[PDB]
Every structure is written in structure tokens, then in C-alpha cells.
């Protein structure tokens, strides 16, 4: 496709500006964070970004969401960074799951975001998503705990709502704007038209996108 | 400003994203070429992006739009740009003009058509201003030389607007669109309201930038 071929080259594009952004931190700090989203979208940004020759090994990545599932789960957020941006000179790289061995993540959270804060915050990047909900991590218009993952300043917060069929983790948006480079990722028609909308107002709580609209953010979008 | 720092720090990752799309085209071709916009949010990418060590010699500088005016004129977008891009390592590029000493641009458009297709197109980037009004280089929605500035597969095309002080050459949006990474770089809420409508809709007449927001894109926005 030349959907298909415009969708790799803005990926490879990005890789580059995510790459760079990392090199630039690790020249003034021992480590560097990277913060990535699943879905099917960053694909060839994982994979374009994974193949770079970077001191990895000095390289924490995490994620901005993930489902309550076991890491090998078909919808693990964990299993698509492991399968695809944690391969070559990234393998080296140092992946930290939002999840625990807890049946339920009200009881997992804690431990989770004990983890959160030990990773070199300001991240580098932070790579989000939109859903054509205006969505964003898991910051869903239709949660009841969107207001807490809004407003606290804890790393990361149980999340459940109607509209998604599983429990969830959310970094918090505190916790996610802590970056010197925020990219929203995004292909289609339809998140195009979503994303307008996000930029035309500024409530928040309506479109959970537009916590980073208000702040400096490259968005990479392709048909 | 916290204003100014995000807009510093937008610039630095915009320049490294630019450097390294020159980068990737120059390990393919013997020379790459960088299309730039004038104006003043594009000053602090022209000196991050000047500073950085790349095989300068071999990359080819041109203007997305330019104003009828002498090179030392304070209107003049090639001042702009010598003063401030072609710096230090990145004084080593050959920037190509988009006038001649004609006194009219009607006069000089073909000498000025003639040297851009002799550079190396697709360009390695054409970044991207907006105004507004929702114009991009010199695509004005109130220039009756707009349609065929659109339309056009010639590389430069004359514009006169009542909206703006001077006479202009424009390259083409064909010409524009050659490329394999183009940025919008645009900053402050009143643009990121103009984008949103831009967004929101498909006539190009009306807001010219829209002819860039439906192929890939990388918009990079600050408060
Ligand atoms: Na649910
Ligand atoms: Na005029």
C-alpha cells in the first residue's frame, strides 16, 4: 500500500526523533526512560526504533497503560513492546511491566507504582496513543476514576470503565507529562477528525488527549 | 519564560529529527536537500539544527516561500536563514535563493523555476509554517494566483495577496509535497486553533495548509 508505505516512513521518522531524544539524555545522565504505547500503530516504530545502535543496556523502558493480564496474554501491552521493540541491539534494554502476581491490580498498584518511581524520571519520551474516543494511556472519558488519574500525584492508578473489556493501570497524567518529549502517534481518517476536535477545546474530562495537547508535543499522523 | 524553555527544547528535538532525515538520505544519495519557512518560531530549530556535525558540504538549502525583496532586505526569508541557519558547521551548505534581479517576480519565476529543479527532490524535509490565516509558505486563501499555485506541477509560481505587504514566489504544493518527511512547526494558542479547524475540514481553498494535513505529517506545537 502507499497507506502502508507512509505509515513506515513516518515510523522511521519517528524511531529517528525518539533515538536522538534518548542519545541526548544519556550524554548528561547514567540512564535515560522511554515510555511507549501498545496497540497496533507503533508496530514499525518499535521495530525501526529497535534495530538502532544505542547503549540500550543504559536504557529503562516502560509503558503508559496496560490490561490486567498475564504477560503472555493476547491483549498484554507487555507482550507486544517484548515481541517487537525489545529484539536486536533494544534487546539489551531494561523493560519494566505495570503488572503483579495480584488477582486484581487495587491490590497490585502499590507495588507497581513503587516501581514507577524508581526509574529515571524526567522520561525522555513519552509515546502516546488516541483512541477514536479521544482517549489516551488508559485516561478514558467513561471512567470513574479518570478525576484521581487526572489529578494525583501518584504514578499510577487502577482503572476500570465500561467501555473496555478489562481492568487497567494508567500512569498518571502528572506522571506522564514528567518528559522533555511527549509524541502522539496516530493514523486514520478518523483519529484525524478526533484529534481536531481535541484541539478545538480544552475540557479535558470530555477528551483525555488534551492533557498533552496543552503542553509542547509532536503528533505524527499518516493516512 | 517556562513558555520560552518549551519552545527551546521543541526546537532542539525538531532539529535532531531533521538532522537525522538528512543523515538517512545522505547515506543513500550523494546530496540532500532541506526545504525551510521563514518567520521567527523557526529561529531557535535554525540554530540547534546549524550546530549539529553532518556532512553539510553536501546538503542543498532552499525556501519554502520568499517576499520580492533584496537579500539584505528585514523582509527577506534568506536573511533570515544566512543569519541564523547557515552557522558554524551548517555554513558548509549551499543555500539556492528564490530570487533574481528582476524587478517584478513575473520577470524572474522561470530562472527561479530553473534552478529548483536542479536540486536533489524528493527533499530529505520541508518544514512548514502556518499562519493565521491558515496559509502555508506563500499559498494565500485570498491570492488569485492560488488555484494554480495548487495545481501546478511547475516548481515556483508568482503570488499576490491583499493580505500581505509585498509581491512573493512560492514553491508549488506539487513541489512542496516531494519530499519524505514534512514538519508543521507552529507555536501559541491561536495557531493551535487554526490547525484544529484546518483539521477539521478538506477545503484547501479555504485553508491552504490543509493541502500538507492529508498526507503524513509531523506536527511539532508549543504553548
Ligand atoms: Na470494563
Ligand atoms: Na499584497
Redesign the pocket.
Known amino acids: 500500500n502507499t497507506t502502508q508505505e507512509g505509515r513506515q516512513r513516518l515510523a522511521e521518522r519517528l524511531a529517528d526523533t525518539v533515538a536522538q531524544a534518548l542519545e541526548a539524555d544519556l550524554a548528561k545522565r547514567e540512564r535515560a526512560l522511554l515510555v511507549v504505547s501498545g496497540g497496533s500503530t507503533p508496530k514499525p516504530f518499535f521495530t525501526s526504533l529497535a534495530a538502532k545502535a544505542l547503549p540500550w543496556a543504559r536504557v529503562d523502558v516502560t509503558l503508559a497503560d496496560e490490561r490486567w493480564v498475564t504477560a503472555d496474554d493476547a491483549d498484554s501491552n507487555a507482550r507486544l513492546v517484548r515481541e517487537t521493540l525489545l529484539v536486536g541491539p533494544a534487546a539489551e534494554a531494561c523493560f519494566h511491566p505495570l503488572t503483579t502476581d495480584d488477582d486484581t491490580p487495587e491490590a497490585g498498584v502499590e507495588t507497581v507504582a513503587e516501581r514507577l518511581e524508581s526509574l529515571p524520571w524526567p522520561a525522555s519520551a513519552v509515546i502516546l496513543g488516541m483512541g477514536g474516543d479521544g482517549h489516551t494511556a488508559s485516561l478514558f472519558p467513561d471512567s470513574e476514576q479518570l478525576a484521581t488519574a487526572l489529578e494525583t500525584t501518584s504514578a499510577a492508578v487502577v482503572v476500570?470503565?465500561?467501555?473496555?473489556?478489562?481492568?487497567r493501570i494508567t500512569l498518571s497524567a502528572s506522571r506522564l507529562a514528567d518528559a522533555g518529549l511527549h509524541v502522539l502517534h496516530i493514523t486514520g481518517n478518523d483519529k484525524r477528525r478526533v484529534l481536531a476536535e481535541a484541539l478545538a477545546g480544552d475540557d479535558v474530562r470530555q477528551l483525555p488527549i488534551r492533557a498533552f495537547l496543552s503542553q509542547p508535543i509532536a503528533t505524527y499522523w499518516a493516512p
Open positions: 476500570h470503565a465500561p467501555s473496555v473489556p478489562q481492568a
